[PDB]
Amino acid sequence: YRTRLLHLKGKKHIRVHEVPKTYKSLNSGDVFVLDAGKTVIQWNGAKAGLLEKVKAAELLQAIEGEREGIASGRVVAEADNDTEFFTLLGDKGPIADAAAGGSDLEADKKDQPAVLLRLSDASGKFEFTEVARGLKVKRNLLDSNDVFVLYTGAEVFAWVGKHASVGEKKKALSFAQEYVQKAGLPIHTPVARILEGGENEVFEDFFD
Ligand SMILES: [Ca+2]
Ligand SMILES: [Ca+2]
Ligand SMILES: [Ca+2]
Ligand SMILES: [Cl-]
Known about the structure:
Blueprint lengths: L3 E6 L5 E5 L11 E6 L2 E6 L5 H18 L4 E6 L5 H7 L14 H7 L4 E6 L6 E7 L13 E5 L4 E5 L5 H17 L8 E5 L5 H5 L3
Parallel strand pairs: 4-5, 9-10
Antiparallel strand pairs: 1-2, 1-3, 3-4, 6-7, 6-8, 8-9
The site of chloride ion has 3 residues, from helix 3.
PDB class: cytosolic protein
Keywords: gelsolin family protein, calcium regulation, cytosolic protein
Assembly: monomeric
């Protein structure tokens, strides 16, 4: 499994990015989730905000629920200097302070990486179209008649509506993989194909 470091940040809402897997990505003002497959560790900065902790905790619960006991989750404080955390991280050193991470208020306003797209072959050809971005990605945009691709800031989901066409159902995953390339995201950005009606905890977690 490819271990990934996730960075959660904000004041009124929380956005998540994949950041380079090193202690240099950390900062004491935010919350990070180290996803090592069977081990998942939430790291709370000494100056982490309540909401950042809450949404990281929700991500852990969703990852746990979706991996069905294969993965265990654990929270550590920055002051704990958790040794398993830094071992899985692969390095250790001084942690940048909160100010070095930038303002949470600016992040709310400037950094909204979510993207929602629709894949539809209703016209007779495949059309792959951006529908909304940032905070305007709302669950009500999903339509059982088509396929939808959601980039959360940390993962790409290909959501297959129950009434998607035969072509939409077959090509859903490949359009979502192609999005990672054309959008210039990290090559190993996780991509998952999911069905309408599934638990889809991590996908559902994005909207609350
Ligand atoms: Ca913060
Ligand atoms: Ca359709
Ligand atoms: Ca949530
Ligand atoms: Cl601030």
